Amino acid sequence: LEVFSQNLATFSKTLLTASSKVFTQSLYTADILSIFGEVFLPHVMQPVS
Amino acid sequence: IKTLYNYYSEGPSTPIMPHLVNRLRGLDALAKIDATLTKVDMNAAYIFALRPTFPYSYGYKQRFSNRRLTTSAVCYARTGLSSFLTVNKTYTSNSPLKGGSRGWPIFNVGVSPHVAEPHMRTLSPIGLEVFSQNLATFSKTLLTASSKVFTQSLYTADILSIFGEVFLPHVMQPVSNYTPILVRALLALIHILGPGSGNCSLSSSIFESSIPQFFTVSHSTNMSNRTRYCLHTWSAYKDMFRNGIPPQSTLPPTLAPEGSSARVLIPAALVTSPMFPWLLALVSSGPQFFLYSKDASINTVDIGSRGRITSPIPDVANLDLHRLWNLFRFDGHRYIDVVIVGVDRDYVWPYQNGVYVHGGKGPNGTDNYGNADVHDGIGTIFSSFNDNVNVQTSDLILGLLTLWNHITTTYATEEEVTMAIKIAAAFALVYPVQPIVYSGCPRAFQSHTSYYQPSSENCYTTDTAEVKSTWDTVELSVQVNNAMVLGMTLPFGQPTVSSAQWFNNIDKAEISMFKVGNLPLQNLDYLSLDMMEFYAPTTGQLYDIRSDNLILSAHRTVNLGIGYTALADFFAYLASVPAQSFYHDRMVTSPISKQTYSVYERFIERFVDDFVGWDRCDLFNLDTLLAAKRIAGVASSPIPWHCSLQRCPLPIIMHYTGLHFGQEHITVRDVEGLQQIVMRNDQGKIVVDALGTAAPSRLAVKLDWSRLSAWYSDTTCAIPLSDRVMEIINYAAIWDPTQERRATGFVYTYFSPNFLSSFNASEPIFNTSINLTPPYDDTTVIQNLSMPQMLSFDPYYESTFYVVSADNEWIPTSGPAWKVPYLENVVKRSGRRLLAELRIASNNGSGDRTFLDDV
Amino acid sequence: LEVFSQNLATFSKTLLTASSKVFTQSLYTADILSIFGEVFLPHVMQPVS
Amino acid sequence: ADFFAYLASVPAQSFYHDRMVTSPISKQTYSVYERFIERFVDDFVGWDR
Amino acid sequence: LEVFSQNLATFSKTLLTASSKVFTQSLYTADILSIFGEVFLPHVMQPVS
Amino acid sequence: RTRYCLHTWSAYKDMFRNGIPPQSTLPGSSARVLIPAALVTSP
Amino acid sequence: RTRYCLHTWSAYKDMFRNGIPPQSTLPGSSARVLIPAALVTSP
Amino acid sequence: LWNLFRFDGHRYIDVVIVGVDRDYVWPYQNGVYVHGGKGPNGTDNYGNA
């Protein structure tokens, strides 16, 4: 949902609501966010499977 | 709401400008919703957008026809040069070529003193925080949008400092306007591809087979409107303003753009975009490079008078095919500081090798380059624009297609696009000199004329396979070439006095102080701020497919340019503006040219303010009209000044104005509008004694527009092909009592037989297999699309003249006694019909009239 | 229908995500739609046969 | 078509090899045969004549 | 009118932004207005002719 | 006769920059038909 | 007669510190007129 | 009568010309060089006023 907010609205620090760096090399940092926003935009816009 | 049927059904009203402007607005609205631009093939949507065809049905009538078999068909007018054929740069030999001009005109456009009015905009969440910084005393709660999660992005605190330092006016008053760059984009696309009818030379026989697929880039220092570029990173650019203010400083912001010393902020992620070189263009001064067709042999074609298509024109070897891109000169920003934001000290310029960004990577491994080198022209950078570079049409327009896709979707509103289309329509097309054919006078009035012999002017064709029309008697000498080069016009009729000439091994351009128009500058601050996401986007869409794409927009501006040309021709036949007032010798032949220009500009200035909404003097001026020079050894043809500024044929004018010239206005039967004209000589013997009918006054046409319809088909005759004798001369003449010798003939602006043969195809493609032969051909007439004779021969003096019979047995009120043309517009392109005109004898029995009379 | 409701959706460009790829990369890009969606975009916009 | 040719009085010799050299009456008969065919095609087929 | 409503606007000086340039730099500065706005400021304040 | 050019989807994609044009170009290539591999074997 | 001095906007700006004074100085320079380049060519 | 009158106007005038390049040519008198425009011997950015 935060990636959806990134792709839907102009950037703001309040949009970053779920990411964290407490856990290292996990699926919850900002580079995973960039991955989701870069190579999976269709599935962010239309979550379907 | 309205359709082409409704527009073709209705005619002009007594207030013409309130009627013509509304009709043009409705035609533009129709052009908006016309499809045939997205799903169709690439070089068919382009050809439909840039070379629109106007259907029409011709036909002529005769008095005593016995089983006369005629063909009712549909033709497609089209006008406008799609390109220009000149001699190649390495010709020498100083000899004429069949269709090769020694030089081409330059329609130079200046910088408008007016500034496009910007409209309101809203700031991004980061921009609102900069507003809070500039509006309130500092607090840590004011910093609400910035973050350091994303490195070297547009959302950290240094970007905030940039916004607060060099863009404070735009933070306080968020405002933007984008019509200048849209105008330049539309003009660039249209000139690169070429609008019009496909004719690509001073001769009306050579055409362009289709839109070119390959271009070549050529460089010429002498005749290039180049601009200077400097490249910096943001750090070095800011550092160069620390020890005082250097000369030519771009640091202060701009609200009213000024020509020199501009600057643009370009993010690093957008430098690599294909739209960046086109964005540096369309705001700079142009053309910084010349665009040619890669091959002029597989693209140029020849059309005969009968419709014979010969592909290789006789002199393919020594000819270049300039696009309209090389015939236009634009003045924009002359010095641009391209400053890249979010870049370290080893940037490396991506496009051109050997070009180093100030503050970036140095020549040989060094970092933080300390030189702000100035590059002359956009070809020294952007390796795609180097000399002798061969480009495919897709790999050259794509960036443009990208740029227009972004601005019209993210940055600009629909009103800006509409204004851009309306403004760009003024420079959309280029038209050659107007040719005319004087029919002469009947032998009965040989002693009462100053213009007895038939003549022709500006009638040039190069086809040799078929028979050449006798009217075309133009030989392309140097003097004639220059005289016709000084004769091309724009949609509003403005000529140019600037020219270029590249041959032997020398390129030389003469650019006069007078310009054909002016264009507004693009404020680069709006571009920079939009490109850093400082403004909120206008729309969240990604594609302009469903709203104002580049091809549909360009189609709209081409339609509006042809409409401007048609309305200008109509205004010429409203103020009695002669064609000869727009030739090379317009400033010395007669002092009445200024008087005609007064009324013509009165019409144009009312049209522009009522429809375009821009300053009139920026789109049309008398500066180039009044700066005529005359070549030297070029003499004017002995033709009376009786025809207007017709640039497009009659069907286009009727389409854009509602003029009706059908067969209902041709009289066949008959109470006293006749007058006997009597003239005696010094011996008291009557020497004329002929019947005549008074030509209508412009007031009468104003109160009844069918008077103009009847005035046509009373003075109009079909143009003969093999002989210089018309069938109207044997019966009628023009009698002007205020003239010393009171008899004359008809002037009849004349296009070509080859040009009208090109009208047969429904799409402007002619390679080998297109059949341009006339429909149902049986046996010598070149078709009359010429507009009637002017209702007045003086721009200010109102006097009455007559159409006078010449034989004895013809009564002018009984109807014309020759081949009398008639026209219709026709929406649905139908096929050939073989019709028969017969006598009515009360025993006329035909199967169709007997059994097919139900409907 | 997925492609149609996709290209019709409102995005906010922003170089963080891939929506900005229609600007930084040619407008005939397949990183927001699919390759087939990019190819059949004109016909997806006007479905006729 | 044969019935229309009878109705429009179209001779059978207007469709031979010498239809154009014999006498111009062939085109005069075509000028009515075409009307008959055009009406029939515009009333039944619905395609361009 | 842009220049007039500009110089009439309330700012908070603060050396972070450019409004403070009328203090740290001569009061005839063109970093808040434009150069033309700075030049025509007295006449923008009182438009007469 | 008419000219036919046979490719694969992966090979046809690699001809152009990275994707194939929405509108087919001029030169063969005047027309383009996309056939799933399951329909090619049909009579 | 009167004395005329012709400059350009960019060159006229560089005479002073960085901007040109709102009030013209004493010495020529007793009066100043700003003309857009499109109006200079007018008769 | 032009010669019979004497008027007192401005004695010193600065013609500025805004929106022009560094190769500007004075279009009214040969041999007259605009400061910041075309120089005497084809030069650019003329330095003397």
Numbering used by the authors:
A (entry chain A), C (entry chain B), E (entry chain B): 197 to 245
B (entry chain A): 70 to 739, 743 to 851, 854 to 929
D (entry chain B): 637 to 685
F (entry chain B), G (entry chain B): 295 to 321, 328 to 343
H (entry chain B): 393 to 441
Question: Paper's wording?
Answer:
The double-stranded (ds)RNA virus Giardia lamblia virus (GLV or Giardiavirus) exclusively infects G. duodenalis. ORF1 expresses a capsid protein (CP) that assembles an icosahedral capsid. The GLV capsid comprises 60 copies of CP dimers named subunits A and B (CP-A and CP-B) in the triangulation number (T) = 1 icosahedral asymmetric unit.
The first high-resolution capsid structure of two GLV subtypes was determined using cryogenic electron microscopy (cryo-EM) single-particle analysis at a resolution of 2.1 Å and 2.6 Å for GLV-HP and GLV-CAT, respectively. GLV-HP tends to form aggregates and accumulate below the trophozoite plasma membrane and inside the cell body, whereas GLV-CAT does not form aggregates, is scattered in the trophozoite, and does not accumulate in the cell body. Hence, this C-terminal interlocking is identified in two directions in the GLV-CAT capsid: CP-A to CP-B and CP-B to CP-A. The C-terminal interlocking includes the same amino acid pairs as Arg671–Asp922 and Lys774–Asp927; however, more intersubunit interactions are identified in GLV-CAT. In the CP-A to CP-B direction, only two possible hydrogen bonds—Arg675–Asp928 and E872–N917—are present in GLV-CAT. In the C-terminal extension of the GLV-CAT subunits, similar swapping occurs structurally on the Lys902 residue. Notably, Phe320 in GLV-HP forms intrasubunit interactions with Val184, Leu590, and Asn592 in the CP-B; however, in GLV-CAT, the corresponding Leu320 in CP-B interacts with Asn112 and Gln282 residues in the adjacent CP-A. The switching between the intrasubunit and intersubunit interactions by the F320L point mutation largely contributes to driving the observed structural change in the variable loop. This additional CP–CP interaction, which is mediated by Leu320 and the variable loop in GLV-CAT, should make the CPs’ network in the capsid more robust. With the more robust C-terminal interlocking in the GLV-CAT capsid, the capsid assembly of GLV-CAT is structurally distinct from that of GLV-HP.
